[PDB]
Curated annotation (Swiss-Prot), chain A:
Function: Stereospecific condensation of phosphoenolpyruvate (PEP) and D-erythrose-4-phosphate (E4P) giving rise to 3-deoxy-D-arabino-heptulosonate-7-phosphate (DAHP).
Activity control summary: Inhibited by tyrosine.
PANTHER family reported for this sequence: PHOSPHO-2-DEHYDRO-3-DEOXYHEPTONATE ALDOLASE DAHP SYNTHETASE, PHOSPHO-2-DEHYDRO-3-DEOXYHEPTONATE ALDOLASE, TYROSINE-INHIBITED
Top-rank taxon: Eukaryota
EC number: 2.5.1.54
Gene this protein is translated from: ARO4
Top EC category: transferase
Protein name: Phospho-2-dehydro-3-deoxyheptonate aldolase, tyrosine-inhibited
Pfam family, one: DAHP_synth_1
Length: 346, 344
């Protein structure tokens, strides 16, 4: 009986329940998470005229830099509360390079998931603890069981939007899920994802106790489409009109990613994409409910030098971000477009 | 308190892989058949054998009886063309034999996994290797020991999760090109699955653990059409070959799906066009995939639960009949026999 010939070995893994006790969620963290979901829900369903903003680092590899950023974003968040509902990007990784905070939390090319999950959860607690909601990519069917309670928003990356596995997973998450369009630039797959995630599914996951079980979902009605470019960009009126053209009756507000395929090989293009999105918003576009910005403390990205995490401070080690000030503007300018759009509807 | 699982209606007890593997044990024959299939598949996709790897069979199995009759027929034909073709049966698992084993929206996974495994044992038991789609990251743990070939479908080839899974399977894995007709994603999948990965899967005992893979060097690309159009023609094969990196394995061409272009009657055609590239010396094509069954076409699921279903007819994709299949395979058989001459 030939089995596991390509499996070098298994390693003990702390269960979700165990991790949730080790690194408990403060009452604030749990309240922050609930609030974020409520606000996000109202915005993508049309009940609120504010714009949902998922902004923050491409990926977090430094909890101390992520905390400084959170404080800054929490303040700005306080000044633009009337127009913008801001959620922080607390992403673990990118698509060859650094494997992410869960796999390689030490950023030294060593794998250590147990410590990774600890960092991941501690991070989420630290952030939501200061009152700042967070969003992350739903990488797999197990990992969310360690962090789902502190998350207000979940995104299903372009490479997995067609994955039956990720559609079933979304149908059972306790928060809004954004499905990015295909890497080939089409929306059909993201529209189908939302339809599917709305139904009830029966899949196999692990319980809070680390055991495999047959899960049964309720269906998620808070799934929307995210426009992020592809084989070209799609944040322009002509493209948005084609998108709207594809959403079924009742579909939720579109979200737009200023990066990746939309800034096509350059973070400097994020502010430009903001103008082209702010325009449509001020002129009265109601289908654009949310935006996604990859910003950091200091612009650009970088690589890991000979040594590990000691590396330019506040600088992404994956996709390049825009600096902070460039972010202050981009958001104040988006808040304006929100107000100006508030009038056109009156 | 907190607010998790608000969309989780509930969990259900699930027999562990180890438990299932004892309940429905694999006969020595089943285990030998599985090993043989992998060896033959490996030799063919790596260039060591001039035969053509053939993954043929139903689009999906919903009837173990009908699947067994078909297996016997295919086993007898497989015995005859064993000199030119290495046949592995399509035994892919409406959600599937696993989610709805009874076919009536009553999702009984435990029974589904039993049927799934019993089926795999029944088939491999008569000496016929089998192949299936690597659905999720847990399911295989209940059937790997019986599988000779695993395919990742178009909608998952880009999934990091499925690339890591392939890197730890004990058999060759075929990655289908994107639903948009491109091969870049399938080529990247093969590159990725060749490396070692660290993911979370469940053990034979139903517990979550950190898995570490060795890397799989037996991953190839499957051409199955797409938006950009069908791709079984020589110019497509050629453009494909030009994109294959150093050390890639032999290409496989799916006759149905995006290449049959919504009409199963086009499979015999793709064959001919592909059989011609082979009979003239094309060695880049080492495998073919065919959605076949006892009776051509497909159907739906009547209010009459399931016992009101046409026998030997697919309840998913349309397939060609046994009759029409035995040709395709005989022509393909010959196309190979020819190739060996052109290379002689
Ligand atoms: N046991 C599988 C590998 C595997 C391990 C863990 C999870 C899923 C699959 C095989 O022999 O191919
Ligand atoms: Mn990024
Ligand atoms: Mn099919």
């Amino acid at each position: 009986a030939e089995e596991d010939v390509r499996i070098l070995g298994y390693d003990p893994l702390a269960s979700p329940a165990l991790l949730q006790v080790q690194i408990p969620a403060t009452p604030t963290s749990l309240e922050t998470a609930k609030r974020g979901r409520r606000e996000a829900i109202d915005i993508i369903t049309g009940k609120d005229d504010r714009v949902l903003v998922i902004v923050g680092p491409c990926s977090i590899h430094d909890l101390e830099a992520a905390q400084e950023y959170a404080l800054r974003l929490k303040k700005l968040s306080d000044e633009l509360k009337g127009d913008l509902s801001i959620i922080m990007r607390a992403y673990l990784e990118k698509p060859v390079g650094w494997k992410g905070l869960i796999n390689d939390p030490d950023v030294n090319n060593t794998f250590n998931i147990n410590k990774g999950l600890q960092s991941a959860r501690q991070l989420f607690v630290n952030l939501t603890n200061i009152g700042l909601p967070i969003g992350s990519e739903m990488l797999d069917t197990i990992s969310p069981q360690y962090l789902a309670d502190l998350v207000s928003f979940g995104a299903i990356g372009a490479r997995t939007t067609e994955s039956q596995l990720h559609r079933e997973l979304a149908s059972g998450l306790s928060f809004p899920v954004g499905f990015k369009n295909g890497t080939d630039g089409t929306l059909n797959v993201a529209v189908d994802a939302c339809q599917a995630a709305a139904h009830s599914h029966h899949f196999m996951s692990v319980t809070k106790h680390g055991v495999a079980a047959i899960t049964t979902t309720k269906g998620n009605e808070h799934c929307f489409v995210i426009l992020r470019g592809g084989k070209g960009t799609n944040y322009d009126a002509k493209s948005v009109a084609e998108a709207k053209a594809q959403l079924p009756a009742g579909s939720n507000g579109l979200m737009i990613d200023y990066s990746h395929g939309n800034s096509n090989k350059d973070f400097r293009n994020q502010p430009k994409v903001n103008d082209v999105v702010c325009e449509q918003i001020a002129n009265g576009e109601n289908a654009i409910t949310g935006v996604m910005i990859e910003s950091n403390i200091n612009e650009g990205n970088q690589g890991i030098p000979a040594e590990g995490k000691a590396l330019k401070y506040g600088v992404s080690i994956t996709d390049a971000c825009i600096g902070w000030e460039t972010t202050e503007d981009v958001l104040r300018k988006l808040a304006a477009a929100v107000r100006q759009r508030r009038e056109v509807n009156k």
